[PDB]
UniProtKB/Swiss-Prot annotation:
Catalysis: reaction(s): L-aspartyl-[protein] + NAD(+) = 4-O-(ADP-D-ribosyl)-L-aspartyl-[protein] + nicotinamide; L-glutamyl-[protein] + NAD(+) = 5-O-(ADP-D-ribosyl)-L-glutamyl-[protein] + nicotinamide; L-lysyl-[protein] + NAD(+) = N(6)-(ADP-D-ribosyl)-L-lysyl-[protein] + nicotinamide + H(+)
Gene: PARP3
Name this polypeptide is given: Protein mono-ADP-ribosyltransferase PARP3
Keywords: ADP-ribosylation, Chromosome, Cytoplasm, Cytoskeleton, DNA damage, DNA repair, Glycosyltransferase, NAD, Nucleotidyltransferase, Nucleus, Transferase
Top-level taxon of the source organism: Eukaryota
GO biological process, one term: negative regulation of telomere maintenance via telomerase
UniProt enzyme class: transferase
Processing after translation: Auto-mono-ADP-ribosylated.
ADP-ribosyl glutamic acid PTM sites in chain numbering: 56, 134-135, 169, 274
EC number, as in UniProt: 2.4.2.-
Positions bearing ADP-ribosyl aspartic acid: 35
């Protein structure tokens, strides 16, 4: 009647990772950090229906702002409906009206993180198979297995290790530099086949993508995604940076013991033919008709003369190794650092996960 729990197959670093990215405490923290009222909206009550209602409430708001003053509901009443469907906590004061584009997108981005938290919870549901088997995996093996994604810890003499480390150091912040703890090689399967469909596409680069810890299990499961309400300064696709310090800005870590722990991806991005912009355009949904990517060009760029290459599944993939240098032609760009954009999920492939302190 009592099921055997099998020993854990996972090395220490991977156990800690898998513990971190499925941690209930980490999830709640992320909710409290987004002003969500965890008491009225607990992890196990979190639902796809509810997130869906939240987005519609947001949609109603966007029509309100981006529309004119017809006879519709005020922003106050429409905000209030949103806050009924997605309960927020602001020390038991009335939450603020969502009454600017900035605020609207901030709330979309929140609901996108929460969706990925619900994804993790959904993923952890116990199947009926699992009730019937008389031995179970170690809980960390089960959780790793749920990702359907391969993770291989790199040690310091792996062929790519020094390349990645140099990428990190040279393009990370000079003073407040992220401390490298571990690198995992990442192979989500079936990501492989969408990516094979861009194989005659050249101009591949390994690019940073920072995220909060709460979406890391979602990304390892499903890839980086372009969701319906996602957006930003270069519109509706997947954001990457050649400067670690840029992507580090979007990492949301958690205090663990004496450390603040955070996670960072490197994606192989098939940029093909690049279209360079120098002003924000949040409406972009694809590159211009000849092009495969949009690069919002920064004041600086890792010194291309120091670029190296890495052979990934037989393809040349460029890895910058130089410190940022000025790019005279983009000195008046609205972008201090470059933002690399692709507008279809198939154009990127997860290659590495980094733990940094
Ligand atoms: N906006 C933006 C630009 C570049 C990288 C990132 C990131 O998520 O790492 C975000």
């Amino acid at each position: 009647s009592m099921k055997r729990v099998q020993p854990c197959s996972l090395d220490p670093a991977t156990q800690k990772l898998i513990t971190n990215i499925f941690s209930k405490e980490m999830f709640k923290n992320t909710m409290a950090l987004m002003d969500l009222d965890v008491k009225k909206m607990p992890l196990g009550k979190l639902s796809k229906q509810q997130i869906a209602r939240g987005f519609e409430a947001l949609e109603a708001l966007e029509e309100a702002l981006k529309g004119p003053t017809d006879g519709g509901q005020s922003l106050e009443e429409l905000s209030s409906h949103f806050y009924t469907v997605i309960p927020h906590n602001f020390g038991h004061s009335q939450p603020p009206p969502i009454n600017s584009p900035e605020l609207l997108q901030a709330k979309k981005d929140m609901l996108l993180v929460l969706a990925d938290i619900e994804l993790a919870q959904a993923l952890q549901a116990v199947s009926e198979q699992e009730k019937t088997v008389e031995e179970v995996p170690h809980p960390l093996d089960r959780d790793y297995q749920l990702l359907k994604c391969q993770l291989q810890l790199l040690d310091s003499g792996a062929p790519e290790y020094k390349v990645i480390q140099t990428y990190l150091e040279q393009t990370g912040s000079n003073h407040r530099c992220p401390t490298l703890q571990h690198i995992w090689k990442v192979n989500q399967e079936g990501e492989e086949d969408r990516f094979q469909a861009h194989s005659k596409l050249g101009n591949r680069k390994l690019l940073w993508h920072g995220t909060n810890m709460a979406v890391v299990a979602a990304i390892l499961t499903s890839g980086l995604r372009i969701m319906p309400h996602s957006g930003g300064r270069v519109g509706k696709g997947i954001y990457f940076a050649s400067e670690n310090s840029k992507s580090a800005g979007y990492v949301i870590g958690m205090k663990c013991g004496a450390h603040h722990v955070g996670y960072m991806f490197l994606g192989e991005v098939a940029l093909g033919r690049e279209h360079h912009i120098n002003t924000d355009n949040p409406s972009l949904k694809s590159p211009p008709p000849g092009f495969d990517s949009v690069i919002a060009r920064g004041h600086t760029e890792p010194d291309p003369t120091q670029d190296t290459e890495l052979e990934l599944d037989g393809q040349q993939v460029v890895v910058p190794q130089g410190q940022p240098v000025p790019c005279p032609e983009f000195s008046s760009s609205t972008f201090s650092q470059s933002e690399y954009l692709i507008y279809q999920e198939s154009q990127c492939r997860l290659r590495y996960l980094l733990e940094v302190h």
